[PDB]
Amino acid sequence: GEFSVCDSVSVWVGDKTTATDIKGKEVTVLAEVNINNSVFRQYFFETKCRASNPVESGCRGIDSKHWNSYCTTTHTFVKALTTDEKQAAWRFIRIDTACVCVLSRKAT
Amino acid sequence: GEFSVCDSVSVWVGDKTTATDIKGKEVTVLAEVNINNSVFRQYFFETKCRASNPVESGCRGIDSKHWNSYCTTTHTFVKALTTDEKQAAWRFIRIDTACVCVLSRKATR
Amino acid sequence: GEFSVCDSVSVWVGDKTTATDIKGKEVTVLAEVNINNSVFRQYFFETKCRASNPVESGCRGIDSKHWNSYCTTTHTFVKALTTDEKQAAWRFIRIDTACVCVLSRKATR
Ligand SMILES: [Zn+2]
Ligand SMILES: [Zn+2]
Ligand SMILES: [Zn+2]
């Protein structure tokens, strides 16, 4: 929980129902997964940005004489039991994992 | 079927009188060009945005949830016979060259 | 704070030897130039796309969920001293002047 150029929020979500697979196709996330005749909930640990601009100028801490910046969220891939309505399988879906600052050089 | 994100208008300009050079000074563009014992008339081909908001939200196709946008004219430098009050002199001057889309991030997510 | 839809790169070219003119014909650009007892080299300020797909999706900021897009270079015309093998004449040649984002619709869901 270190002071950063971008403010984030993390939480455990055990009810995700909708998602984007690795191929970028939307899919539905099965609520109960059954392993070896044992059924479990699918959990994800997600981290979102609090705002795209923690501060007026963009990300906090930036040398704003020379850059433009903003906070955005990034992804990791986790296997999940999903369905796209055609075939039910395990796919890798995106899960937001961080809020990083992207930069752009100020145009002079 | 391909749209452009911004719209522009081209135009052959023979009636320019004033300009901003490369150093950033206001300068006047002379009308005819004399040099090597001959007289021409200065023409510049220019292109610029028809409008700033082709669509309501700004540029076309933009993801409006995340972005704010609008069209703007971009410059190129061109050589031209000019005079600051002082003396005639070729200078590179700045002219409208294109119309492009420019993003601005909406403050939240 | 402004971000751009397409990334361009600008430079100065001092060794152009050939180009396509306003009529679309392949011509020769004179390297040097003597006008009113002086000698100079022809310089042209050019702008191009750093890339066609700045971002994965194509242009930056687009709504790829519904659109296809890419970056592309557009041209201008500029007066230059040239030669069509025989004739030494000023002519407007074609130059890269910018990087714009082009659109294509997509039949979605
Ligand atoms: Zn203008
Ligand atoms: Zn202008
Ligand atoms: Zn080109």
Curated annotation (Swiss-Prot), chain A:
The gene is Ngf. This is Beta-nerve growth factor. It comes from Mus musculus. A 1-acyl-sn-glycero-3-phospho-(1D-myo-inositol) binds at residues 41, 43, 79. Nerve growth factor is important for the development and maintenance of the sympathetic and sensory nervous systems. Extracellular ligand for the NTRK1 and NGFR receptors, activates cellular signaling cascades to regulate neuronal proliferation, differentiation and survival. The immature NGF precursor (proNGF) functions as a ligand for the heterodimeric receptor formed by SORCS2 and NGFR, and activates cellular signaling cascades that lead to inactivation of RAC1 and/or RAC2, reorganization of the actin cytoskeleton and neuronal growth cone collapse. Belongs to the NGF-beta family. Detected in submaxillary gland (at protein level). Highly expressed in male submaxillary gland. Levels are much lower in female submaxillary gland. The chain holds residues 131 to 238 of 241 of the full protein. It is found in: Secreted; Endosome lumen. Disulfide bonds join 6-71, 49-99, 59-101. Homodimer. The homodimer interacts with a single NTRK1 chain. The homodimer interacts with a single NGFR chain. The NGF dimer interacts with a single SORCS2 chain (via extracellular domain). The NGF precursor (proNGF) binds to a receptor complex formed by SORT1 and NGFR, which leads to NGF endocytosis. Both mature NGF and the immature NGF precursor (proNGF) interact with SORCS2 and with the heterodimer formed by SORCS2 and NGFR (via extracellular domains). The NGF precursor (proNGF) has much higher affinity for SORCS2 than mature NGF. A 1-acyl-sn-glycero-3-phospho-L-serine binds at residues 41, 79. Changing residue 79 to L: Near loss of the ability to trigger histamine release from mast cells. No effect on interaction with NTRK1. Transmembrane segments: none annotated. Induction: Expression oscillates in a circadian manner in the suprachiasmatic nucleus (SCN) of the brain.
